[PDB]
Amino acid sequence: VQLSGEEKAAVLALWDKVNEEEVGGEALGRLLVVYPWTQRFFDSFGDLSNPGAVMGNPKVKAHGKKVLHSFGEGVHHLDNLKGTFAALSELHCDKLHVDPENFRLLGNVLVVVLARHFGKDFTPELQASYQKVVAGVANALAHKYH
């Protein structure tokens, strides 16, 4: 959201190196292994027993990719998040009934997987930034929860 040209440029340049399948299936997988209560929502997706099943499950990968693509749309509509997610919010509150906080969670999980993937170049400076983006997307996905 409200930040800086040099930070934006930075955030963006990093997002051209983000393999959305890899980092995608990784976030959703860990979310499920680290915060097991979220296994309840994605309940059809076959076997989500041990972390080995979660991680190598084709449906975690495919939805993961759908999640991270949604994130990028956001990394590129810096000034219009609320508008961007003014539907993924409705489908999350009503049809899904998902607690607002579970978002910030998947967010911090997405920052951690970026962290392992881009080592030292994932500077406290650049994560400093990402927290803002993850913060904004969270607030937008819950916007319609009143």
Place this chain on the structure above:
Amino acid sequence: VLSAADKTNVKAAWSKVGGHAGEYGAEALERMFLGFPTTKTYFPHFDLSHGSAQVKAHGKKVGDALTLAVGHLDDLPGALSDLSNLHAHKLRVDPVNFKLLSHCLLSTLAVHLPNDFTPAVHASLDKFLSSVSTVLTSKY
């Protein structure tokens, strides 16, 4: 820390960490100050400058507080019941701030140990970091 399989990942994962505890202690703090700015008001007496021998000389203090707890998994209330009276009694630190340090410290470990920071262990550490957080916020 709690379950066996968990107390097994923590001692194992931390041996991975080894003698880089204060360094990492340092960095996590550096990542929480910039990333989550409010936390910076708990340290008016601090050189909040990147390179600060102070922020640098406390991460080593935080690293050791954490190495000890690693070796005291069976009883955390007792082996930290000073740090418990410190953060909660003398300082009044908010229970939501510990998550910010727990997030940063984890974001960090992921930066220095990519191959070792696996899902199973990431699970465990989150737990170990929740438990220690509780102990310190226990006097509330």
